[PDB]
């Protein structure tokens, strides 16, 4: 009858469940489980299933999608709260119904159910923008038409499950109520070139960080529909963003090759620059091949509150820690070298040897771009993806000083616009679905369409772990 008594009752129920599951495991432990459930907010990687994974037997499945060039994807997964004990989902029908949202250049928002890890993602609902939402002023701050009219580019689903928020080239940002997909609120970015390029929610919260291509990072509170803040400091388009449970975020600004970490409340930022030199690399290899030099930094994700990984556009995956300004462990061409152009087509002249000379041997080879990169939060595995038609799963060492290639997954084919993961099962036995939004073109511009057999779709790989 009392709130304190209610909370005691729920907690004792929690303990009954924990003891039953501990006995099940048996057929220290309870303290350990409680300590982990605490250990989420202390931002040290604790989730260490790095080697229990069975990559070779992961079950792969493509699922084609109608619209062309899916741009991005965002997965929503209900958890159980530990302060209170109700649930993460909103209503009561849901009770742990795993959702996914995909946004496509064709101006389409599509929500699927992926609850069952054995059947295909089922297309629940969708909403399509279009030309009828073009603003009548077209030349002012107000841009507030209830739909998208250009190139939805990123999506993010709110951790409480009520809204999903999308933004793209139209310089808007729209929050939808999830069930009816109905647009509940529209916020302009109010800048002539303020295109939204990435969205990230601070975990378990309603603070959304929108990396926008006017060199700025806007920050909104969604449960109040307002823009808290703008953060300045980049030199090129702020191409990608990622945030975790703390009051921080990390961004990569593309051409300045610069990864910046934003501690919001302190109002401070830390600058991380790469800086490999190919000739130094050559000297080092003589002391001990091709050494491309870093073009731009494309994608980012925090593995932890103190460590984050940045994939560039020259095949490099770097692992950075907040302590040292240089990366602590860089890793070379991740997805291999881009295949050689054909001699006949490079030359335009029937002399075969002339055409080969045209191909020039090595000097025209280029590395695959890291187009997508994702680290399962506070864990020691991360998934990298390019348009080499194969996701690469990697495991970080225990000392957090290096990482190795755990394995591959060859079901994908095309440009991997975005990667996401969903967990399910019991705390001991956890199934991992890896979703990837795949399309024919890179999500920002075209630049590339010649890929053998790319198809617009959702690539789902279910992984199980034993040991």
């Amino acid at each position: 009858e009392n709130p304190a008594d209610k909370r005691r009752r729920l907690a004792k129920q929690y303990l009954e469940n924990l003891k039953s599951e501990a006995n099940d495991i048996l057929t220290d432990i309870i303290a350990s489980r409680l300590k982990e459930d605490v250990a989420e907010q202390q931002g040290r990687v604790f989730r260490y299933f790095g080697d229990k994974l069975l990559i070779s037997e992961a079950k792969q499945s493509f699922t084609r999608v109608g619209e062309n060039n899916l741009t991005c994807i965002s997965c929503f997964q209900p958890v159980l709260n530990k302060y209170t004990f109700e649930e993460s989902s909103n209503g009561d029908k849901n009770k742990g119904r795993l959702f996914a949202y995909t946004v496509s250049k064709d101006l389409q928002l599509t929500k699927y159910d992926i609850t069952d890890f054995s059947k295909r993602p089922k297309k629940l609902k969708y909403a399509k923008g279009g030309a009828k939402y073009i603003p009548t002023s077209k030349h002012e701050y107000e841009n507030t038409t209830e739909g998208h009219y250009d190139e939805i580019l990123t999506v993010a689903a709110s951790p409480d499950g009520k809204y999903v928020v999308t933004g793209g080239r139209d310089r808007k940002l729209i929050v939808w109520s999830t069930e009816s997909l109905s647009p509940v609120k529209v916020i302009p970015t109010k800048d002539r070139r303020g295109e939204v390029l990435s969205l990230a929610f601070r975990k378990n919260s309603d603070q959304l960080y929108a990396s926008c291509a006017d060199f700025k990072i806007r920050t909104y509170s969604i449960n109040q529909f307002s823009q808290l803040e703008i953060l300045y400091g980049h030199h090129d388009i702020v191409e990608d963003i990622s945030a975790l449970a703390m009051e921080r975020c990390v961004t990569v600004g593309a051409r300045d090759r610069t990864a910046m970490l934003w501690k919001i409340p302190d109002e401070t930022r830390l600058t991380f620059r790469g800086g490999d030199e190919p000739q130094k690399l050559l000297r080092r290899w003589m002391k001990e091949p091709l050494f491309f030099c870093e073009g731009s930094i494309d994608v980012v994700s925090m593995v932890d509150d103190f460590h984050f990984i940045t994939g560039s556009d020259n095949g490099n995956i770097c692992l950075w820690s907040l302590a040292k300004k240089k990366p602590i462990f860089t890793e070379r061409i991740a997805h291999g070298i881009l295949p050689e152009p054909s001699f006949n087509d490079i030359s335009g002249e029937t002399d075969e040897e002339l055409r080969k000379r045209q191909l020039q041997g090595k000097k025209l080879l280029q590395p695959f771009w890291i187009t997508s990169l994702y680290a399962i939060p506070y864990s020691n595995v991360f998934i990298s993806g390019s348009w080499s038609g194969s996701l690469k799963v990697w495991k970080i060492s225990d000392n957090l000083r290096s990482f190795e290639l755990l394995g591959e997954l060859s079901g994908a084919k095309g440009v991997v616009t975005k990667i996401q993961v969903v967990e399910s099962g019991k705390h001991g036995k956890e199934k991992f679905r890896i979703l990837a939004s795949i399309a024919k073109e890179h999500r920002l511009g075209r630049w590339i369409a010649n890929v053998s057999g790319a198809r617009n779709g959702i690539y789902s790989a279910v992984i199980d772990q034993t040991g």
Binding site: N344, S347, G348, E349, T350, D351, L354
Partner: protein
């Protein structure tokens, strides 16, 4: 109007072909044919 469209498209492809044939020692009916097919497909679109 589409007369002007097609004329100018043809002029572009013609200039490219001239470049190829001038700077290639022994040019290739392959590029000639593919470029002609490109113009033909555009014309069919019209």
């Amino acid at each position: 109007k589409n007369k002007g469209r097609i004329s100018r498209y043809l002029a572009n492809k013609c200039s490219m072909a001239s470049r190829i044939d001038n700077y290639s020692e022994e040019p290739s009916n392959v590029f000639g044919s593919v470029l002609k097919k490109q113009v033909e497909q555009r014309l069919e679109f019209y």
